[PDB]
């Protein structure tokens, strides 16, 4: 299809600016000034930022301003935060076609971000699962930032070969990430251990938390 | 609350039809019949389907129609397949601003295994947490079949909000979906109730588990 045309990503640190062009926007029939910005996080709807090229709805934050020249505009972010990483796509009123063209996108990530270790809890199996026959241990694993873990189990101190999973990590609402990891286990298996431990790896530090029947 | 409302999630079977639905067309001022459908896929760009309306842009399969009644649009879905599972956004032009307003989106699922209910398991926070004066709990929810779900906290018969944290569904090995909801509050605040509910909800059903301090 027909796109205004945008860079495909940008990246800048903390208290950073980003300025985002899109070019393509100049109407053919008319000369309309009807360019927007909108704002798409992962699964969720696109966010009007800017419109008529520099008006900014209300609830949006000022360190977003729109502007033209000629055939191109931008979108500037000012003192850039976490929370801005995400997709912004332009829009724009094409007169040569007499409907609305949008832009292919632009994916903004925020580098230099502070590493931030993960923090783990370690839940062993409740009375209340045990009384129904079945033994689960839940390792939390949060506020880690980069995003990426490796999560093993031991029963006593050797590896747990089967009934593992462990969920992709999600961006939280303090912009850390957050997963968890649950090893289904028969009441016989947990019991037959001195303890079980989660052992959780990130940027190649290892952190460890253990629990024992009681 | 927003412009263009649909339901947040629907699922078909292959082969079968289904229409989602958006309202609030007419009341956006300067729509005319600047309704246009789009389909998103996990990381790409959304992709139109439909554009005033009931056109289709080039490529798109007659599959898809899209349709509009009063202050709703549809777009209908024929002969379901696989690769149609994904987000779909009703958009509007908006006159007042100049812009596009897009609808909160629907996921759709197309049915590949029966559904299945997630599994509930409620933890009370570890000794070795609230030693360290901190009290999680955690709501895990597994093997849940669409992968959509919404939770609510209650500490006693009253909901709660503050410490509420919840992944986004993460899908497990046996292809069924896996989440955790936890609630981080104060080992004080964890004695001042008699009890803690994790409330889960999916297709239709609102499954609850309950958690006491002993």
């Known amino acids: 299809q027909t796109a205004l045309t945008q860079p495909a990503s940008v990246s800048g ?9 899109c070019t393509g926007v100049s109407s053919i029939v008319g000369s309309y000034n009807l360019v927007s910005w909108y704002q798409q996080h992962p699964g ?21 301003s729109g502007s033209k020249s000629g055939n191109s505009a931008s979108l500037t972010i000012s003192g850039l935060q976490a929370e801005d990483e995400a997709d912004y796509y332009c829009s724009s009123y094409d007169g040569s076609s007499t409907s ?4 292919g996108g632009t994916k903004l ?12 809890t370690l839940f062993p199996p409740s009375s209340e699962e045990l009384q129904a026959n079945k033994a689960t241990l839940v390792c939390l694993i949060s506020d880690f930032y980069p995003g990426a873990v490796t999560v093993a189990w031991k ?11 462990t969920t992709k990590p999600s961006k939280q609402s303090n912009n850390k990430y957050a997963a968890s ?21 990130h940027e190649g530090s290892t952190v460890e938390k253990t629990v024992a029947p009681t």
Do not use: M
Request: net charge positive; charged share 20%; hydrophobic share 30%.
């Open 181 to 201: 990891s649950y090893l289904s286990l028969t009441p016989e298996q947990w019991k037959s251990h001195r303890s079980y431990s989660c052992q959780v790896t």
């Open 155 to 165: 029963a006593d101190s050797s590896p747990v070969k089967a009934g593992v999973e």
């Open 109 to 120: 990530t925020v580098l230099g971000q502070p590493k931030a270790a993960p923090s783990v």
């Open 13 to 21: 640190s903390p208290g950073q600016s980003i300025t985002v062009s």
């Open 44 to 64: 969720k709807a696109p966010k009007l930022l800017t419109y008529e090229v520099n008006k900014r709805p209300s609830g949006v934050s000022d360190r977003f």
């Open 100 to 103: 609305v063209v949008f832009g």
